[PDB]
Design a protein around this ligand. Structure first.
Ligand SMILES: Nc1nc2c(ncn2[C@@H]2O[C@H](COP(=O)(O)CP(=O)(O)OP(=O)(O)O)[C@@H](O)[C@H]2O)c(=O)[nH]1
Ligand SMILES: [Mg+2]
Ligand SMILES: [Zn+2]
Ligand SMILES: [Zn+2]
Ligand SMILES: [Zn+2]
Lengths: 47, 179, 59, 176, 57, 601, 101, 100, 115
DNA sequence: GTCAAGTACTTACGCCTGGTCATTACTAGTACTGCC
DNA sequence: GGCAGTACTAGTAAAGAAAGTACTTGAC
RNA sequence: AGACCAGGC
C-alpha cells in the first residue's frame, strides 16, 4: 500500500532521518548495519 | 533495521530499543557451539591456549572487578533461591547487565557460571583448576557477538528458511506461524 | 575542468571584509612570493610581481 | 581597493597528500584559485595567508600536529573544513581607479590596472568635446580638452565591472 | 477473426460462452520431439481459472 | 561508479511536502496547452506534450538548456486547469474536513474549547512530551467567562511544559519524534477525526448544516436539510456542489481554525511557520513530467507514444473544451440552460481525467495505468526498480561439479574470464603485470579491454592492432599534461585473474549462506562454473541443470568483504542453530567407510 | 556495489536551498564564458528583480533571469530522479537537504 | 558572515558534545569483524590511489595484500569513529584496537 | 540445431507505393569484403560459414543510392543450409521482397548438457 | 451513545530462458469508369 | 466530349468457486 | 514496455 503510506507521510510533513535500510537504498545512502555502522578517519601528520 | 549497537544492546534503526542484551547473554550462535563442551576443551587445553593466549590479552582488560561481583551474587543466589520468583528481593543485578561483557573478564551468564563450576566440581582432574576457569571466561568473552551484526535478518532467516522444510487437534506447522 | 578536485565544494565567509593599506599588501607580497618558490601557477606569479613592482617600481 | 577576507571552505584531500595535508589543499584548491575572479569572495584572488585545517575530533587542541580527516565511504579521498585568509581585489562602482594606458585604439581606451587587470573605457563614455587624430603610417593618441597627447595614468570612476568571461575587466565612465 | 483466434488464443465474443476462462485456448504444437508432438494431442487442461487458485483439492 | 570521481555532498534527510500551484508556475519550462503530440513529418508541436522546452527529443536540441539527448536531463512543465479539482490522494482526508464543519461560522461543529484541547495535546506530542499530554486533560448553559479561563490555563500549562523540557536537556526545538509518540499521535488524530464526524449541531452557534455525500470520486453532493430542524436555523436572530464551492468553504475553515490544523499536519514542529491552506488538498495545476521520462516505446516502426501522454491528452482536450464552453458565457434563456448543463457535465469529466492520470482505479471507464500504479506492487517501482535492480558486471551459467578446487574457490570459464573486468588504477607496483595485461589485449588471457585515462577519456582495445596496443602500454605510467588532473592515474580495466574475488549466489536466496564470496581459479576448457562439493550443502544445489549467479565486485571496499566478511570459510556454521552446513557429501563419505575400516592395509 | 554503484549510479546536481533533484539545470553561456549549473525554483525573473554581473544567466529560450547558484553534485540512484518525476505529478514535493551548507 | 558564523559555532559545539573523552569510552577494545573488513578495505583504495606506504613491499602487487600486511605491524593511519545510538561517538585508532 | 529467420524487405510501406529496396548490389562504392559470403543476387551461398558480424544478405536502396547489408545478429556461428525465395500472391507480378533462410549449428555435446 | 450488518479494501516464493501478438470501424474523399 | 455511380482509400475517431482489518452506515 | 503461452531449477 505504497500510496497509502505516501499520503499519511505527506499529511504529517514527515521528515525521516534515513535510518532504515529500506530508506537508504531509495536515496542511495550507505546502509547503517554492519560495515556502515561507523566512519573511517584518516590521521594526517601535519597541521 | 535491528542490529547490535556498541552498547551491547540490540535495537532498531531509528533508535528504539528491542532488547537490552542479545538473548540475555550477547554471544554469537556461530561461536557458542563448543562453549559448554568443557571436557572437550579440557582435553584440548594446550592447543586452545595457543589461540586465546591469556597473558597477551590481560593488558587491555580488567580482570579484578567483574570476578568479584560474579561471586557477590552467586553466593547470594546459592544461599537463597529455595523460594519462588515473586518472593526474591534480589538486592543485586545479574552480573552481565552491570559490567561490559566484552571488556571485563569474568562477566558471564548465570548458566555459564553454574555449568562451569558444576563441571568443575562433579569431577576433579598438568592443568589445574584456576588455569581452566580463566580460559573458559576468556573463551566466553571472545565468543561475544560483535557490535553491528545484522540480528533481525539472521533472526528472520532462522525462522523463514526452516519454514520451507515443512514443504519443499491443535493447529500445526506453517498455518500456525501465520497466526 | 571545474571538478571537486579543482574547486572547493562549499565556500562561505567567516567575517565581513575590512580594508587594508599598501603596507599590508607589500608585507603580503614579501611573504607570499617568499612562501611560494622558497606548481604551474607561475602565470599567476608573474602577474603578482607586476603588482609587487607596482608599489615599488615602474613597468 | 584590496580587501581582506577570512573564509570557511569545504575541500577534498587526495591520498598522495596523506603525508602533507597542508600543501595538498594548496596545490588543488588554492593555487588554481589565485589571479582568477571568484563570485563567493567578491573579486580577484591575489593570494592566501595562514591555512588552518579544522580537525575532526573536538578533543585535540589546535597546537597538535596529528589531525584527522573523514574519508568518504565510496572513494578514498578525504573531505575537511579549513580556514584561510584570502587577500582579494574587488573594484566597486563609485570608486576612482588609477588607469595606466596599454592599448590606444580608436574605439576604446583598453588599458591595464596595476599592470595586471584589464579595463575598458568606451568611446561613448568619452565626451564629445575630445578629439582623436588619425594615424596613416602606423593607433595614435586621443586629444582631450587640454589639447595634449594622453600618456599613462588616469584617475577615473567605475561604471561597471564585467567578470563573466576569461579575465576581469572594469568599465569606466568620464562623468563625475 | 478465426486466424486471430488461433494465433492468439483469446476468445472475443459479445455473448461470452458457457466456460470460465477467456484466454489460452490455442497452444503452439512444438515439433521439438515426436514424444512432445504426440503429447499435445492427448493433453487435457482444466482451465486458467484453476491455475491462479491457491487450493489443493 | 568511478572511485576517482568523488562526491562531497550527502543527502541527509528527506521531508515530504505538498507542491503548491505557485511554485510550479515558477519551476516550469513552458506551459503546454494543445492536445496534440506531434504533427506530420515527426516534429514535436510547440506548446504540446512533446516540446523542445521540456527537454531534448529524438535527435533535436532542447530549448531550455540547449543540449542533446545525452546531456539534457529533461525539464518540468505544467498545465493550467481552469477549475480547481480534487487531488485523489487526499480526497478521503478532505471528505472528513468537508464534513465536520459548520457552514455558517466556519468552525468545526465541536465546541471550540474541546477543539482547543487537541490543539494543545498535539503540541506536546510534537516535542518529546508524551507523558505531559495526559496531565493536560486533568484541568477542569456554560458562559464564555470560564471557558476563556480554561483555555488560558491550558495554554500556559503547555508553554510551561515545553520551555522546561527544552531547557532540561530533553527535547530540541526541532522536536523529539520516536515510534511510541507516533503511536500516541496516530491514536489521538484518529480520535480527533472520529469525534469531528460525530456532530449534530455546531457547539459555537447552535444550528444545523446539511449532510454531505460521497458518491465515489469525481462527484460531491450535499443532501436536503429536513423540515423539523430548519426551525433551529430560524431562531438565530441531492444538490451537486461544485469544486470551487468546496474550496471556498475550506478556505474559511482553515483561517478560523488555523491554531489547530498547524499541529494536525505537523509531526515535528513547524519551524518554517508556513500556513496550512485549503489549496493543499486541491490541485489547480498539473505537472507534466520531463519528456525523457515519457519517451515513446520504439519497436522498429511500431511506434506507440507513452501512455502518460495519452492520459494528459484527455486532460488537455477537456480543458480546451471547457474554455469554449466559457466563451458562450460571454455570449449570454433557453440557451442558458443547455450550455450550462453541459458545462456542469464538463466539470465532472475534467476531474475524471485528473483522476485517471493519477490513479487508474479511481476513474470509471483495458484501462491505462496511472501514476499510482507505476509504484505499488511487485512490478511497481520500489520493489521492481529500487529494492532490487538489474546489475552490471555479473554472469550466470549452469554449474558442473569439480574436485581439485580448494573449497573456497569457483572455477570460471574463458568466456567469463574475458568479458568481466576490473578497474585497476596504475601505480609503481602494477606496471609490471599490468603493462603485460594491456599488451595481451581483450582476447588473450590474462588481458585488458579498456584504458581509462586521467581526463575521463575511456580508450577501448577491441579494434586495435597489437603494434598500436604496445604504444599505449608505454604511455600508461606518464605524468599529467594537465594541472587539473595531476592527482589521478590511469585505470586499466584488466581481465579477471587468479587473485580476484567473486560473489556466487543461487536462488531462492533463503538464508544468508546462499550468497557467499569465493576466490577464482580460471579454468581453460568449457563454458560452465565449477563448484566444489562442500559448498553445495549451503547453496542447496544439485547438478541436474542448476545455474547460479556470479557477481563480480568493482572496488576494494567490496573485495575486502567477500574475502573477510562474506567469506565462504567464515560461513561454516549457519546461524540458525549453530550446526555446520559445509562438508563432503556422497562419495567422500562412502570412501571413508572403506578407508577407515579394519581391512584397509 | 550491487544495488547502487554498478546498476544506476549517477552524479546529479542538487540545489542546497531547494533540495530538489529535477529543478536545477544548465545555463546557456555567452561566447568565451563557461557554463554553470543553476536552479529554476529559487530563481527570480530579471524583469521582476530590478545585480552583480554573475548571478544573471539565461535559458535557450532567451528569457534571461537572475537565479540561485546554490547547487552541487550528489551521488544518487537514477531511479530517485524518476521517483520525483512521478511524485511531483501527484503534487508531492520531496525536499533533499544536503549536509554541507 | 555573521549569520554563517552562528551556523558554524552551533555545528562545532554540538559535535563537541558528542565527543566522548578518551578515558570515558566504554565500548569493546576488540576490533570487530566489520571494522577489520573496512580498515583493510579503505586503506586498499588509498594505496591504489598513490598513498604513501609504510611497509616494505615484497613484490606484492595486490593493494589489498598491502593493507593486510600493514595491519600486521600496526602501520595503518586510520581511526574508527564508533557512533552511538544517541549520535555520540568514540574515536579508537587502529593501533589501540587488538585483533581477534 | 536448425534455426530459421525471415528476411522481409517490405516491412515499411503499404498499398502500391513503389519498391524502394531491391536485392542485389548497386553501383555505389561498396567494399569487396563481402563477396566471400554473398552471391551476385545479394543472397548468401549455400553452405557458407557465418558468425556474428558477417552479412546475411545484401540489398540496394533507391532513396539513398547505397547497398546496405543485413548482418547475422547471433553470437553463435552457423552454417547456411537453404535459402528460399518467397513470391507474393498478386495479379501484378512483383520483384521479390521476402527471403527465408535456414541456419544449422553444430551442437557437439559440451559439458553441462543435460542427459 | 452503543452495537451491530454489510461493505470495501489489501495481500498472496525467488530467479532464469524461449516463442507470438499487437485497433477497428467508418467516413468522407479523390479517382476510376460507365454512360449518353 | 463531360456527367454521376461505385469501389476504393487513406483518413482520423472509439475500444464465473481464496483470506484478513478498516469503514461508514444503521437499527434502535 | 505489456498480454498470453511454453518451460528450467
Ligand atoms: N523457491 C522455489 N524453489 C524451487 C522451485 N522449484 C524448484 N526449486 C528448487 O529446486 C530444487 C528442486 O528439487 P526437486 O523438485 O527436484 C525434489 P528432488 O527429490 O528431485 O531433489 P533431489 O533429491 O535433489 O533430486 C529444490 O531444491 C528447490 O529448492 C520453486 O518453484 N520455487
Ligand atoms: Mg537442481
Ligand atoms: Zn534542456
Ligand atoms: Zn457554526
Ligand atoms: Zn533553489
Amino acid at each position: 500500500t505504497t500510496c497509502q503510506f505516501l499520503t499519511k507521510a505527506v499529511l504529517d510533513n514527515e521528515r525521516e532521518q534515513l535510518d532504515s535500510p529500506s530508506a537508504r537504498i531509495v536515496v542511495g545512502k550507505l546502509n547503517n548495519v554492519g560495515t556502515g555502522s561507523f566512519d573511517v578517519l584518516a590521521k594526517v601528520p601535519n597541521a | 533495521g535491528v542490529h547490535v549497537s556498541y552498547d551491547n544492546s540490540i535495537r532498531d534503526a531509528d533508535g528504539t530499543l528491542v532488547q537490552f542484551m542479545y538473548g540475555g547473554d550477547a554471544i554469537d550462535i556461530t561461536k557458542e557451539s563448543h562453549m559448554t563442551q568443557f571436557e572437550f576443551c579440557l582435553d584440548n587445553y594446550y592447543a586452545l591456549l595457543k589461540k586465546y593466549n591469556p597473558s597477551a590479552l590481560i593488558e587491555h582488560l580488567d580482570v579484578e572487578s567483574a570476578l568479584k561481583y560474579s561471586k557477590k551474587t552467586l553466593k547470594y543466589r546459592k544461599k537463597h533461591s529455595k523460594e519462588p520468583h515473586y518472593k526474591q528481593s534480589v538486592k543485586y543485578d545479574p552480573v552481565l547487565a552491570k559490567y561490559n561483557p566484552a571488556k571485563y573478564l569474568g562477566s558471564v551468564s548465570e548458566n555459564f557460571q553454574d555449568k562451569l563450576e558444576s563441571f568443575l566440581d562433579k569431577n576433579s582432574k598438568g592443568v589445574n583448576e584456576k588455569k581452566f576457569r580463566a580460559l573458559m571466561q576468556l573463551k566466553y568473552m571472545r565468543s561475544l557477538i560483535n557490535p553491528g551484526e545484522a540480528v533481525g535478518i539472521i533472526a528472520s532467516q532462522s525462522v523463514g528458511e526452516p519454514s520451507t522444510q515443512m514443504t519443499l487437534n491443535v493447529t500445526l506447522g506453517i498455518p500456525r506461524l501465520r497466526e | 575542468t571545474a571538478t571537486t578536485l579543482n574547486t572547493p565544494v562549499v565556500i562561505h565567509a567567516t567575517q565581513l571584509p575590512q580594508h587594508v593599506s599598501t603596507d599590508e599588501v607589500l608585507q603580503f607580497l614579501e611573504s607570499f612570493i617568499d612562501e611560494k618558490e622558497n606548481t604551474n601557477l607561475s602565470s599567476s606569479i608573474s602577474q603578482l610581481k607586476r603588482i609587487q613592482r607596482d608599489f615599488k617600481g615602474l613597468p | 581597493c584590496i580587501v581582506r577576507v577570512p573564509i570557511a571552505l569545504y575541500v577534498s584531500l587526495a591520498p598522495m597528500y596523506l603525508e602533507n595535508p597542508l600543501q595538498g589543499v594548496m596545490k588543488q584548491h588554492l593555487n588554481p584559485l589565485v589571479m582568477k575572479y571568484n563570485n563567493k569572495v567578491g573579486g580577484v584572488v591575489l593570494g592566501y595567508e595562514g591555512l588552518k585545517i579544522l580537525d575532526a575530533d573536538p578533543l585535540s587542541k589546535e597546537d597538535t600536529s596529528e589531525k584527522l580527516i573523514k574519508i568518504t565511504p565510496d572513494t578514498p579521498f578525504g573531505f575537511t573544513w579549513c580556514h584561510v585568509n584570502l587577500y582579494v581585489w574587488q573594484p566597486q562602482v563609485g570608486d576612482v581607479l588609477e588607469g595606466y594606458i596599454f592599448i590606444q585604439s580608436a574605439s576604446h581606451i583598453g588599458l591595464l590596472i596595476h599592470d595586471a587587470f584589464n579595463a575598458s573605457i568606451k568611446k561613448n563614455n568619452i565626451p564629445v568635446d575630445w578629439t582623436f587624430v588619425h594615424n596613416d603610417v602606423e593607433l595614435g593618441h586621443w586629444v582631450d580638452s587640454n589639447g595634449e597627447p594622453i600618456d599613462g595614468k588616469l584617475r577615473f570612476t567605475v561604471r561597471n565591472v564585467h567578470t563573466t568571461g576569461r579575465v576581469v575587466s572594469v568599465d569606466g565612465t568620464l562623468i563625475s | 477473426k478465426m486466424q486471430y483466434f488461433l494465433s492468439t488464443g483469446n476468445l472475443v465474443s459479445q455473448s461470452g460462452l458457457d466456460l470460465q476462462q477467456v484466454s489460452g485456448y490455442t497452444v503452439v504444437a512444438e515439433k521439438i520431439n515426436f514424444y512432445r508432438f504426440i503429447s499435445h494431442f492427448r493433453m487435457v487442461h482444466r482451465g486458467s481459472f484453476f491455475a491462479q487458485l491457491k487450493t489443493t483439492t | 561508479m568511478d572511485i576517482s570521481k568523488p562526491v562531497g555532498s550527502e543527502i541527509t534527510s528527506v521531508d515530504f511536502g505538498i507542491l503548491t500551484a505557485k511554485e510550479i508556475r515558477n519551476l516550469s519550462a513552458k506551459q503546454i496547452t494543445n492536445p496534440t503530440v506531434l504533427d506530420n513529418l515527426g516534429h514535436p508541436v510547440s506548446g504540446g506534450l512533446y516540446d523542445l522546452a521540456l527537454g531534448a527529443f529524438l535527435r533535436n536540441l532542447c530549448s531550455t538548456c540547449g543540449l542533446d539527448e545525452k546531456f539534457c536531463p529533461g525539464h518540468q512543465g505544467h498545465i493550467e486547469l481552469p477549475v480547481p479539482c480534487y487531488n485523489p490522494l487526499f480526497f478521503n482526508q478532505l471528505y472528513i474536513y468537508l464534513r465536520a464543519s459548520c457552514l455558517f461560522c466556519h468552525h468545526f461543529r465541536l465546541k471550540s474549547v474541546e477543539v482547543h484541547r487537541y490543539a494543545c495535546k498535539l503540541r506536546l506530542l510534537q516535542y518529546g512530551l508524551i507523558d505531559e499530554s495526559y496531565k493536560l486533560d486533568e484541568i477542569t448553559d456554560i458562559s464564555s467567562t470560564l471557558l476563556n479561563e480554561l483555555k488560558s490555563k491550558r495554554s500556559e500549562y503547555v508553554d510551561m511544559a515545553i520551555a522546561k523540557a527544552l531547557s532540561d536537556g530533553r527535547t530540541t526545538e526541532r522536536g523529539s519524534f520516536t515510534a511510541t509518540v507516533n503511536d500516541e499521535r496516530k491514536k489521538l488524530v484518529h480520535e480527533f477525526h472520529k469525534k469531528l464526524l460525530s456532530r449534530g449541531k455546531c457547539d459555537n452557534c447552535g444550528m444545523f448544516s446539511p449532510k454531505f455525500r460521497k458518491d465515489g470520486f469525481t462527484k460531491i453532493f450535499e443532501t436536503a436539510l429536513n423540515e423539523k430542524q430548519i426551525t433551529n436555523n430560524r431562531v438565530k436572530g441531492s444538490t451537486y456542489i461544485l469544486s470551487t464551492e468546496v474550496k471556498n468553504i475550506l478556505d474559511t475553515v482553515f483561517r478560523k481554525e488555523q491554531c489547530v490544523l498547524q499541529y494536525v499536519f505537523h509531526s515535528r514542529p513547524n519551524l518554517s511557520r508556513k500556513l496550512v491552506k485549503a489549496d493543499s488538498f486541491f490541485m489547480d495545476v498539473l505537472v507534466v513530467p520531463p519528456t525523457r521520462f515519457r519517451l515513446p516505446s520504439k519497436l522498429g516502426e511500431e511506434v506507440h507514444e507513452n501512455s502518460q501522454n495519452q492520459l494528459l491528452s484527455k486532460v488537455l482536450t477537456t480543458s480546451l473544451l471547457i474554455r469554449d464552453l466559457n466563451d458562450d458565457l460571454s455570449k449570454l434563456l433557453e440557451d442558458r440552460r443547455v450550455i450550462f448543463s453541459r458545462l456542469m457535465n464538463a466539470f465532472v469529466t475534467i476531474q475524471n481525467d485528473v483522476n485517471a492520470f493519477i490513479d487508474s482505479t479511481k476513474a470509471q471507464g483495458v484501462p491505462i495505468p496511472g501514476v499510482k500504479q507505476a509504484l505499488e506492487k511487485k512490478e511497481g517501482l520500489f520493489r521492481k526498480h529500487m529494492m532490487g535492480k538489474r546489475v552490471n558486471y555479473a554472469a550466470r551459467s549452469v554449474i558442473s561439479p569439480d574436485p581439485n578446487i580448494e573449497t573456497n574457490e569457483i572455477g570460471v570459464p574463458p568466456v567469463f574470464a574475458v568479458k568481466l573486468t576490473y578497474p585497476e588504477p596504475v601505480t609503481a607496483y602494477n606496471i609490471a603485470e599490468l603493462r603485460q595485461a594491456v599488451i595481451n589485449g581483450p582476447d588473450k588471457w590474462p588481458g585488458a579491454t579498456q584504458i581509462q585515462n586521467e581526463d575521463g577519456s575511456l580508450v577501448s582495445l577491441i579494434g586495435m592492432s597489437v603494434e598500436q596496443r604496445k604504444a599505449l602500454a608505454n604511455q600508461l605510467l606518464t605524468p599529467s599534461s594537465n594541472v587539473s588532473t595531476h592527482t589521478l592515474n590511469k585505470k586499466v580495466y584488466r581481465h579477471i585473474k587468479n587473485r580476484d574475488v567473486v560473489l556466487m549466489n543461487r536462488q531462492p536466496t533463503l538464508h544468508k549462506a546462499s550468497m557467499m564470496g569465493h576466490k577464482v581459479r580460471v579454468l581453460p576448457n568449457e563454458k560452465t562454473l565449477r563448484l566444489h562439493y562442500a559448498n553445495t550443502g549451503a547453496y542447496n544445489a544439485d547438478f541436474d541443470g542448476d545455474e547460479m549467479n556470479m557477481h563480480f565486485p568493482q572496488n576494494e571496499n567490496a573485495r575486502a568483504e567477500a574475502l573477510n566478511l562474506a567469506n565462504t570459510d567464515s560461513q561454516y556454521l549457519t546461524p540458525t542453530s549453530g550446526s555446520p552446513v559445509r562438508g563432503l557429501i556422497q562419495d567422500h563419505i562412502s570412501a571413508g567407510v572403506w578407508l577407515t575400516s579394519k581391512d584397509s592395509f | 556495489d550491487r544495488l547502487l554503484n554498478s546498476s544506476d549510479y549517477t552524479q546529479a546536481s542538487v540545489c542546497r536551498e531547494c533540495g530538489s533533484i529535477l529543478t536545477t539545470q544548465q545555463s546557456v553561456p555567452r561566447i568565451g564564458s563557461i557554463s554553470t549549473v543553476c536552479c529554476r525554483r529559487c530563481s527570480m525573473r530579471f524583469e521582476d528583480a530590478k545585480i552583480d554581473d554573475s548571478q544573471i544567466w539565461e535559458d535557450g529560450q532567451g528569457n534571461k533571469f537572475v537565479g540561485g547558484n546554490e547547487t552541487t553534485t550528489v551521488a544518487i540512484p537514477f531511479v530517485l530522479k524518476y521517483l520525483d518525476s512521478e511524485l511531483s505529478a501527484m503534487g508531492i514535493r520531496l525536499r533533499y537537504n544536503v549536509e554541507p551548507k | 558572515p555573521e549569520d554563517f558564523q552562528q551556523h558554524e559555532q552551533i555545528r562545532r559545539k554540538t559535535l563537541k558534545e558528542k565527543a566522548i573523552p578518551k578515558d570515558q569510552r566504554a565500548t569493546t577494545p576488540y576490533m570487530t569483524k566489520y571494522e577489520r573488513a573496512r580498515i583493510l578495505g579503505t586503506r586498499a583504495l588509498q594505496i591504489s590511489m598513490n598513498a604513501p606506504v609504510f611497509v616494505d613491499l615484497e613484490g606484492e602487487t595486490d593493494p589489498l595484500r598491502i593493507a593486510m600486511k600493514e595491519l600486521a605491524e600496526k602501520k595503518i593511519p586510520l581511526v574508527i569513529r564508533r557512533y552511538l545510538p544517541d549520535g555520540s561517538f568514540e574515536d579508537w585508532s587502529v593501533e589501540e584496537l587488538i585483533v581477534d | 540445431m536448425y534455426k530459421t529467420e525471415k528476411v522481409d524487405l517490405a516491412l515499411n510501406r503499404n498499398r502500391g507505393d513503389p519498391i524502394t529496396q531491391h536485392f542485389g548490389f548497386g553501383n555505389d562504392e561498396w567494399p569487396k569484403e563481402w563477396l566471400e559470403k554473398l552471391d551476385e543476387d545479394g543472397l548468401p551461398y549455400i553452405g557458407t560459414y557465418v558468425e556474428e558480424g558477417d552479412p546475411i544478405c545484401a540489398y540496394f536502396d533507391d532513396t539513398l543510392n547505397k547497398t546496405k547489408i543485413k548482418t547475422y545478429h547471433s553470437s553463435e556461428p552457423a552454417y547456411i543450409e537453404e535459402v528460399n525465395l518467397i513470391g507474393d500472391e498478386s495479379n501484378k507480378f512483383q520483384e521479390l521482397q521476402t527471403v527465408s533462410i535456414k541456419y544449422r549449428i553444430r551442437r557437439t555435446p559440451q559439458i553441462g548438457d543435460k542427459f
